[PDB]
Amino acid sequence: HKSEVAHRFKDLGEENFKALVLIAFAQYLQQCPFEDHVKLVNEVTEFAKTCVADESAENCDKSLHTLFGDKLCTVATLRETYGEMADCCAKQEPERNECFLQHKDDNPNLPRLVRPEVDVMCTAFHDNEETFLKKYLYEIARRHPYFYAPELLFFAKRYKAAFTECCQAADKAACLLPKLDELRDEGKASSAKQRLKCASLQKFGERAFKAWAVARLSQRFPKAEFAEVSKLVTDLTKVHTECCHGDLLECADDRADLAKYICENQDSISSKLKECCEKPLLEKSHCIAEVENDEMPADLPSLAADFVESKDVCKNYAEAKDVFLGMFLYEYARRHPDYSVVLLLRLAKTYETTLEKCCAAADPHECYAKVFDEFKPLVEEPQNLIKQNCELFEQLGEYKFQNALLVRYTKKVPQVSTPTLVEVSRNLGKVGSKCCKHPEAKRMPCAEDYLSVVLNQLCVLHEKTPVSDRVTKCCTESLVNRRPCFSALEVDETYVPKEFNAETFTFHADICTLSEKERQIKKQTALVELVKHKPKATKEQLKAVMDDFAAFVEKCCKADDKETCFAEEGKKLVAASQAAL
Ligand SMILES: CCCCC1C(=O)N(c2ccccc2)N(c2ccccc2)C1=O
Ligand SMILES: CCCCCCCCCCCCCC(=O)O
Ligand SMILES: CCCCCCCCCCCCCC(=O)O
Ligand SMILES: CCCCCCCCCCCCCC(=O)O
Ligand SMILES: CCCCCCCCCCCCCC(=O)O
Missing domain, CATH: 1.10.246.10 (Serum Albumin; Chain A, Domain 1)
Structure with missing residues (x-):
């Protein structure tokens, strides 16, 4: 198409376009305030609409990288705030975007985000849903400049649904709090998975990543052909290599291309992709990435045939080691969706170490004839x-x-x-x-x-x-x-226990007035300190002490007078426990 922005605006929709532009800017200009970002979004969107009306309007022919870069270089305080990043503006676009990428700060020093009271959130939400959500979207994106933008949008929508629902309920807090905690955990997990994926790709290399993907994709698409699985693993590796470099536009286009390739060859891959492939551009890839395992053929041969009993195993292996090992992974993983991917990789590494030793011996078959027996202990x-x-x-x-x-x-x-x-x-x-x-x-x-x-x-x-x-x-x-x-x-057995510390085991009534999670964490902290002081203590000794502490806490929080109980009965507990241990 003649205009990039116009095209993107069209299949994304105005609402999605606006939220994504906000996220993209917040991840690069992590120090600029909300009001400035909103201003940028409005200008980019307004420009986008001009191009929608006429793909020939001025600048509408410019690529997205160029347009994004030109607007970034428009920020007047760019030098005084980001300094060195401002020098990125003196380069020709190709190099310019790379320069901006190099200067993206991953671990910035922004104050931790504090969860306000449920009623302030709900009131804010009702008074101005737009600014409430977008401001938090901005706050989250500036703190995680690496988090793939469309996924952050997917999270935003779930937060909106949680407020919409809970802010119109009898007991808001009982409704919203657990939803917010589950969302945060899930959000943190997603972040960790993304970082882990990239770091592993850098540390262990492409071969290891490819093996991991072959196993994962074979469990999910057992009816697919090996050649098709290999095609997908290749594209998938390229996609993640690029997405890990950090360029949103490149990453997004590669993912989209892959998602459509998958949908077009749907019947040749899995019968579980139907839904995912009818969803809008924005959700396709995400959905596919979570699709459930298709059911296996059930009428499948025995692995032993082609990988143990067969003659020419060593011959097929020597001819193309990785392809043969990949074939092995494929065959094994599609029959075992119940295995973790890393277990499958251990089996593969074990089958490889055996062929390497065995294919160099007189009678190969004899040597590697019992390979499957080495798998059992790994599985169990x-x-x-x-x-x-x-x-x-x-x-x-x-x-x-x-x-x-x-x-x-x-x-x-x-x-x-x-x-x-x-x-x-x-x-x-x-x-x-x-x-x-x-x-x-x-x-x-x-x-x-x-x-x-x-x-x-x-x-x-x-x-x-x-x-x-x-x-x-x-x-x-x-x-x-x-x-x-x-x-x-x-x-x-080497560890030398830590000296006794009265403080560490002193307790007050303030524990009675604490929230469940808070009480547990204080008790658990004490439990860990106990083990560090008396590491040789037994499960029985320990159970007895944890039980006394129990009754003790209930006793002192259920008395006409506290604090004294904790201090008086606390003296006892501590002294007794010491002796018992
Ligand atoms: C390394 C993490 C795995 C997540 C994942 C992914 O990014 N793609 C994925 C990538 C882009 C668009 C759609 C899905 N698919 C995927 C599914 C089937 C075949 C190939 C790739 C996935 O399962
Ligand atoms: C991308 C998510 C959209 C943000 C809107 C939801 C607002 C949630 C505010 C709570 C943030 C504090 C972090 C926490 O949950 O402890
Ligand atoms: C396209 C085929 C690529 C797959 C190659 C198969 C390699 C199997 C070896 C097991 C992988 C574990 C790697 C490791 O030890 O970290
Ligand atoms: C204590 C963690 C709670 C879950 C209990 C199961 C322990 C998980 C061990 C199995 C891990 C599977 C991954 C692997 O193959 O290493
Ligand atoms: C440094 C923090 C303490 C170490 C935590 C141990 C984590 C091990 C998780 C593996 C779960 C399988 C259960 C096990 O064998 O321990």
Whole structure:
């Protein structure tokens, strides 16, 4: 088409166009105030409308990069506020956009965003829904300049729906709060997944990413042909490489192209793509990215034939190693949607290590004839951990389950900071209440998805202020061995317990007037400090002390007079506990 802006404006729609332009500007000019951004959006939109009316109006022929760049260079304070970024304006567009990209700040220093009271939000929402939502949209985008724009818009729409619903209810707070917490967690998870995807692509390379995608796409589109799966994995790798570089326009066009390619060859890929392919341009790719697994052929051959029993295995493998291994991944993954992708990768790595050794020996067949027996122990490991932990989560509840994990991990890595241990254990706890509800067939994929982010949040932090070689080890190993590594950590027999600290175990009545989450976190913090002081303590000793603390807290919060009870009975509890331990 003769005009880029006009075309985009047309298939996006005015409302979507406006929100996206706002996000795009906020991610580049992270320091400019809201009023200035709104002003820019209005000018770009007004210009866009001119081009819609006549693709021949002036400047309507300019590319989007050029137009975006020219408007960015119009900001008068560009130099005084962003300094060096202002020098990007002296370059020819091609280089200009690259320069702006290089100067995008990922971890800016903006005040943390505080959640106001439910009634102020609801009142604000009713008085001016537009400015309320757009201002928060701006606040979120300036803080996450890397978050893929269209997905942020998808989140905004869900927030709107939460206010619309809850702000017109009897008990607003009881309605809205849980929705906001779920949205935030989900928002943070999405952010982590995006960063993880790019970092892994940079650290481990294209081959590893391609294997990961082959496995994932084969579980989802089992009826698709291997050649079709390879086509998709290739385009998908290119798409993420570009999206990770950070250029929104390039990223968006590649994704769109891929989404249409998929819809046009729908019948040749999966019968589950029907809905996704009838959705508007903006939602297509997102929908496809979450499509459920198509059902498998059910009348499929045995893997043993072509990969163990067959003659010429070594011959087909030597002829094209990666293609053969990819074929193996494809065949194995499409018969196992119940496996995590990383498990499939372990199987593949194991099959590769075996052919490398075995294909160089006299009688190949004999050497690699028992490969499938090496797979069994690899499979069972995550499966046992699932049942074992989910059952426990069932006996106890989410809270006591978190406490169980708390005792378990403080003992393995007592060096870690107490707030980190609490944070991590609580998140692990949630993965349990969220995945253990799924039937066995969907548990591993679920746990893998959530554990990948929790483990990455854990590693990133630790990276900053490292405290344990073991954690560093597990954090730097391959993403395939990451979870196994942590699971293999044993109690720290070297750790020297921390001296007693009266303060740490002193409690007041203010705990009675705290919110549930707040009470738990204070108790859990104490629970971690206890284990750090008495690491050799037993599950029984510990249970007894946690129970005394329990009755104690209920007793002191249920008395004609508090504070005294906590101080008087607190003296007791502490002294007794010490002796018992
Ligand atoms: C690496 C993360 C995986 C998310 C994902 C993605 O970005 N695309 C995706 C990319 C662009 C448009 C639509 C979907 N599809 C995808 C689905 C089937 C075949 C190929 C790719 C996905 O599953
Ligand atoms: C992209 C999301 C649109 C933003 C509009 C929703 C406003 C939510 C305000 C709450 C932000 C504070 C963060 C939190 O939830 O704790
Ligand atoms: C297009 C085919 C590309 C897939 C290549 C198959 C490679 C399988 C090896 C297992 C991948 C795990 C990589 C790793 O050890 O980090
Ligand atoms: C304590 C976390 C709560 C979930 C309980 C199951 C434990 C997850 C282990 C299985 C991980 C599957 C991913 C992998 O293959 O490594
Ligand atoms: C440094 C923070 C403490 C370490 C947290 C351990 C994380 C391991 C998660 C793996 C879940 C499987 C259960 C397990 O084997 O521990």
